[PDB]
Paper text:
At the parasite–host interface, F. hepatica calcium-binding proteins (FhCaBPs) have a unique EF-hand/DLC-like domain fusion found only in trematodes. A unique family of proteins called calcium-binding protein (CaBPs) or tegumental allergen-like (TALs) proteins are abundant in trematodes. These proteins have a dynein light chain (DLC)-like domain at the C-terminal and a calmodulin-like domain with an EF-hand motif at the N-terminal. Among the F. hepatica paralogs, FhCaBP4 is notable because unlike other proteins in this group, it exhibits calcium-dependent dimerization and increases hydrophobic surface exposure upon calcium ion binding.
We successfully determined the crystal structure of the apo form at 1.93 Å resolution. The asymmetric unit contained two FhCaBP4 molecules forming a homodimer with a two-fold axis. Each FhCaBP4 monomer consists of an N-terminal calmodulin-like domain (residues 4–90) connected via a 10-residue flexible hinge to a C-terminal dynein light chain (DLC)-like domain (residues 101–190). The α1 to α4 helices form classical EF-hand motifs, where two helix–loop–helix structures are connected by two short antiparallel β-sheets (β1 and β2) that flank the Ca2+-binding loops. The DLC-like domain adopts a compact β-sandwich fold composed of antiparallel β-strands (β3, β5, β6, β4) capped by an α6/α7 helical hairpin.Sequence conservation analysis revealed that the EF-hand motifs are genetically conserved, whereas the flexible linker region is not, suggesting that this region may confer species-specific flexibility and functional diversity. Five residues (W163 to S167) of each protomer in the extended loop interact with five residues (Q’154 to V’157) of the neighboring protomer in the β4-strand through a pair of hydrogen bonds. Superposition with the FhCaBP2 DLC-like domain model (5XF0) yielded an RMSD of 1.45 Å over 88 Cα atoms in PyMOL and 1.0 Å with a Z-score of 16.1 for 87 Cα atoms in DALI, highlighting strong conservation within the FhCaBP family. However, a key deviation was found in the flexible loop between β4 and β5 (residues Phe166 to Phe171), which displayed significant conformational variability despite the conserved sequence. The elevated number of interactions in FhCaBP4, particularly those involving Glu12 and Glu78 located in helices α1 and α5, respectively, indicates that the calmodulin-like domain contributes to stabilizing the flexible loop within the DLC-like domain. The calmodulin-like domain exhibited an RMSD of 3.5 Å (79 Cα atoms, DALI Z-score 7.6), whereas the DLC-like domain remained structurally stable (RMSD 0.5 Å, 90 Cα atoms, DALI Z-score 20.0).
Residue numbers in the entry:
A (entry chain B), B (entry chain A): 4 to 190
Write the structure that this text describes.
């Protein structure tokens, strides 16, 4: 069923769907064909394929794929399973009063981030002077548990945003009057 | 005139001010002296200064400095020129109605960015259905003319932010009811 995100994220999702835990190896041609059948630009995919060092059989290991794209293989193993989980029917609710605006995160990670924001907010009382502390605590949690470096914002009122982030690392949500925007970038 | 920004940004500004020869050569002892005069902490300066492969003649070239620090050499050449203009009393005024909240951008880039936001906004009518297009135009302009990748936000209301940006590449400003946040992250 449906597949979502930027072109690079869709290629990564398709690689993870073809990948099998037993060997973590994906056929280059099968990856290209799946990208074609999901309408990705031909030039872009061919340019990505040239970045991957395939073996003599034309197979890309998950490690080589992540290395070439600046991804963390251990993290992509977890993403693979957390996405399979929801496709298999084992989805979870979001925590109470969480409204997701947009996201590229796996569902488990969405629960993790929104529950930590609610926990940090509950300890400070949610006044504007306490919001700097909440933002710093949420950024610290994200930087440590999910790698550096995270852009972290809380705002009230209306907003419009065009932004760039590492694959699957972005989430925009609302709890009451607070809008929370988090995403990861390199370094 | 006064240094601004992070310790790393201040050390880079000092490097560019010291670089006053045709070969882009800076004397490492002179750089340390400037950092000491500007009360930059020794622990951080020493960590950065060890990232450079000084020639054993105690000299660092702009190119070596930029490579060790993850800066684009051509951008730093232009940054030096723009900052010196301001030091010389020859900077541009900010355009009408622009209130700068925080920035480590050079003055000429601050003028260009806030000017471009006003022009993109003036060609739409300023309505909320049109602001997604304003933000997209600004981000695309910045990505192309000043390198990838730019984060771009327009907001009405209040905000709290912890974020990370490349040296000199961040600007927050207000024009009328709109607060505009822009900054660049790697890649």
């Amino acid at each position: 069923v449906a597949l979502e995100g930027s072109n690079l994220e869709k290629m990564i999702q398709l690689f993870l769907q073809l990948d099998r835990n037993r060997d973590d190896i994906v056929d280059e041609n099968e990856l290209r064909q799946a990208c074609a059948e999901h309408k990705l630009p031909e030039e872009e995919v061919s340019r990505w394929l040239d970045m991957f060092d395939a073996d003599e059989n034309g197979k890309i290991t998950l490690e080589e794929f992540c290395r070439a794209l600046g991804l963390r293989t251990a993290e992509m193993r977890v993403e693979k399973m957390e996405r399979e989980e929801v496709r298999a029917g084992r989805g979870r609710p979001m925590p109470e009063d969480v409204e997701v605006i947009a996201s590229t995160m796996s569902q488990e990670k969405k629960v993790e981030v929104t529950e930590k924001f609610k926990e940090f907010l509950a300890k400070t009382g949610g006044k504007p002077e306490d919001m700097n502390l909440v933002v710093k605590q949420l950024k610290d949690y994200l930087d440590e548990r999910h790698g550096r470096v995270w852009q972290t914002l809380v705002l009230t009122g209306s907003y419009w945003m065009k932004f760039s982030h590492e694959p699957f690392m972005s989430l925009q949500f609302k709890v009451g009057p607070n809008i929370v925007l988090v995403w990861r970038t390199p370094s």
